[PDB]
Amino acid sequence: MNTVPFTSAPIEVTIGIDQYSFNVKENQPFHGIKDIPIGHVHVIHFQHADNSSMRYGYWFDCRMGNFYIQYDPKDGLYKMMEERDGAKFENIVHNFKERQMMVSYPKIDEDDTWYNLTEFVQMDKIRKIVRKDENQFSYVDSSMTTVQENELSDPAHSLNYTVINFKSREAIRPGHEMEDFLDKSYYLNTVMLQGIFKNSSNYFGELQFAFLNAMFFGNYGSSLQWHAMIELICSSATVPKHMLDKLDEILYYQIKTLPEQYSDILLNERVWNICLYSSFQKNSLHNTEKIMENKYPELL
Amino acid sequence: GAMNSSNYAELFNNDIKLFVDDTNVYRVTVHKTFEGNVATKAINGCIFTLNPKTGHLFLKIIHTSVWAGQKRLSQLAKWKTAEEVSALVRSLPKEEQPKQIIVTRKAMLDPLEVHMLDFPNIAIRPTELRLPFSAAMSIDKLSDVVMKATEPQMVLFNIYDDWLDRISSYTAFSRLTLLLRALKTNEESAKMILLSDPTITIKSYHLWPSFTDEQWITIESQMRDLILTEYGRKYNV
């Protein structure tokens, strides 16, 4: 069980840790989050009480180093930093724990929600989508644009999701225009799975990371990426059976976790209606169709 | 974006453009089977590809053999149209290739956009105009070359005959759309108006009769009257 200590909390802020969140008051003696499950990526996220604009946060994995949060009064945000001195860090955490100034990662033993949302997500893949190679953790916020959004403007602060474009030479083989447009199996299986992602695990990891950035930061380009990766599978007649079964489980936990009040902005009517009712895979997503029909029947 | 009444003069500027109408590509007769079910029999069709500035018509004849053993023909017809327009563009020298293609039906946008990915600088546009190009097969000489075809064929026409010697492209397009609108609304009556006087003939190298400027005014009047009458009937007004 790992710990992310905080130097202090000088500004009032809502703090997120994965799917959980806590309000901290201005100068409240808050010194961090303990009992964080080893074996998963995590995200620690912020929304200032005085500017609810710019949700921002840090993807990290406690196996990769000792991370802490410290407020920067110049840049006006909570920053993640790595502590390279192991003994200094152990001594800081032990003190804050002894003084019980840390919130406990509030995991219910029965509850596989975080594992289910992050099953294929790997820190090394996050660090290639979010490029800042001097840090082992990755900063994301509400406003960061994707490589695809930029093409259609600061490259260093972009989300480098894999570009998916149904009306592109990459998606359409010369001489198979109608076949490749109506059945995206060659784009899914040859170009994306064999060509770019190498395997379905990397494809699902990116899909899962896009959804979590959409949900936790209201990142609009992430939401576009999540829907494009769903639509590419649903619009393919030929998908490995294990991939369809796994996609149904992934989407089920995503729809289950989504705040009921955000369905209006986080879910694309056209994509979901097409995926569940018109697509090749209309009958392949039993769990997802049942939760969507019971939780969001308006959308459909 | 979309071509409408507001940007109408753009049709007659010096940027090469083509209209594409796919409404006569897939044509059928519906009939009863021996067992009393219904079946279709395809007949020859055509792509209507027109330069509105010059009157040059690229009439690609669609022979019934292209449907043999295919499924979902109304869908395939849009893709086959897009394939043939793309092939026509690649066959033209660069300086003759259009800068825009306007499709008369929005269902042609994705098929044509996907077939033209190699031409990112050619804009594919819809139109809000309700153009009567479906009535092309009411022009006897176009109907005749389509029905007689025994294989895929491209035939080139000037749909304005020699009108551009005397009138502007704008006026020639206005005349063509009025003729086609009349032929579409009441073909028999339209055809009677065009041929009633036996002294005015169609030249071997022309589609329409050799009307004087004064005779075209009378004809154009007779076509507008046909259209309004028919409209008062259609709607009881």
Residues 6 or more apart whose Cβ sits within 8 Å of residue B222: B193
C-beta of residue A120 within 8 angstroms of C-beta of residue A197: no
Which three-class secondary structure state does DSSP give residue A192? helix
Query: Which chain B residues contact residue A186 at CB under 8 A?
Result: none
Query: Which chain A residues contact residue B117 at CB under 8 A?
Result: 167-169, 172
A167 vs B79: CB contact, 8 Å cut-off?
no
Please indicate if any CB of chain B lies within 8 Å of the CB of A169.
yes
Q: Give the resolution value in Å.
A: 1.6
Q: In the sheet where A138-141 sits, what is the strand order?
A: A20-24, A13-17, A42-48, A56-60, A138-141
- DSSP 8-state code for residue A246: H
Chain A (178-197) residues lying within 8 Å, Cβ to Cβ, of chain B: 178, 181
Query: Which chain A residues contact residue B76 at CB under 8 A?
Result: 178
B110 vs A177: CB contact, 8 Å cut-off?
no
Tokens of B27: 């044509």
Nearest-CA distance A205 → chain B (Å): 30
A177 vs B113: CB contact, 8 Å cut-off?
no
Question: With the CA atoms of A64, A67, A72 and A77 taken in that order, what torsion angle do they form, in degrees rounded to the nearest 10?
Answer: 70
**DSSP code per residue over B218-237:** HHHHHHHHHHHHHHHHHHT-
The residue among A51, A70, A67, A49 whose CA lies nearest residue A59 is A67
In the block, residue with structure tokens 């996907």: B114
Q: To 5 degrees, how large is the angle CA A288–CA A292–CA A293? A: 115
Tokens of A99: 């003084």
Q: For residues A170 and A196, what is the distance between their CA atoms, to the nearest angstrom?
A: 11
CB A258: neighbour CB atoms within 10 A? 18
Residue of B nearest to A166 (CA): B114
| Helical (H) or strand (E) element with B88 | helix B73-91
- CA B35 to chain centroid, in Å, comes to 38
Of A167, A169, A178, the CB nearest to B79: A178
Please indicate if any CB of chain B lies within 8 Å of the CB of A177.
yes
What structural domains and CATH numbers belong to chain B? 9-163 (3.30.420.230), 164-237 (1.20.80.40)
Please indicate if any CB of chain A lies within 8 Å of the CB of B74.
no
Nearest-CA distance B115 → chain A (Å): 6
C-beta of residue A263 within 8 angstroms of C-beta of residue A299: yes
C-beta of residue B199 within 8 angstroms of C-beta of residue B78: no
Nearest-CA distance B4 → chain A (Å): 26
Residue of A nearest to B120 (CA): A168
Query: Which chain B residues contact residue A177 at CB under 8 A?
Result: 79, 82-83, 111, 114-115
C-beta of residue A158 within 8 angstroms of C-beta of residue A143: no
A181 vs B117: CB contact, 8 Å cut-off?
no
Residue of A nearest to B78 (CA): A178
Q: For residues A126 and A172, what is the distance between their CA atoms, to the nearest angstrom?
A: 28
B83 vs A167: CB contact, 8 Å cut-off?
no
Nearest-CA distance A38 → chain B (Å): 48
Query: Which chain B residues contact residue A235 at CB under 8 A?
Result: none
Amino acid residing at A131: R
Q: To 5 degrees, how large is the angle CA A108–CA A26–CA A9? A: 60
Q: For residues A174 and B32, what is the distance between their CA atoms, to the nearest angstrom?
A: 40
Q: To 5 degrees, how large is the angle CA A273–CA A202–CA A276? A: 10
B113 vs A167: CB contact, 8 Å cut-off?
yes
The residue among A289, A164, A286 whose CA lies nearest residue A226 is A164
What are the residues facing B211 on neighbouring strands?
A: none
Nearest-CA distance B113 → chain A (Å): 8
Please indicate if any CB of chain B lies within 8 Å of the CB of A167.
yes
A178 vs B117: CB contact, 8 Å cut-off?
no
Please indicate if any CB of chain A lies within 8 Å of the CB of B83.
yes
Please indicate if any CB of chain A lies within 8 Å of the CB of B77.
no
Nearest-CA distance A171 → chain B (Å): 10
Q: For residues A16 and A57, what is the distance between their CA atoms, to the nearest angstrom?
A: 8
Nearest-CA distance A56 → chain B (Å): 38
Question: With the CA atoms of B127, B132, B135 and B136 taken in that order, what torsion angle do they form, in degrees rounded to the nearest 10?
Answer: -60
| Helical (H) or strand (E) element with A16 | strand A13-17
Residues 6 or more apart whose Cβ sits within 8 Å of residue B64: B42, B43, B44
Question: With the CA atoms of B69, B74, B75 and B78 taken in that order, what torsion angle do they form, in degrees rounded to the nearest 10?
Answer: 110
Please indicate if any CB of chain A lies within 8 Å of the CB of B92.
no
**DSSP code per residue over A261-275:** GGHHHHS-HHHHHII
What structural domains and CATH numbers belong to chain A? 1-143 (2.60.34.20), 144-300 (1.25.40.550)
Which three-class secondary structure state does DSSP give residue A135? coil
C-beta of residue A233 within 8 angstroms of C-beta of residue A226: no
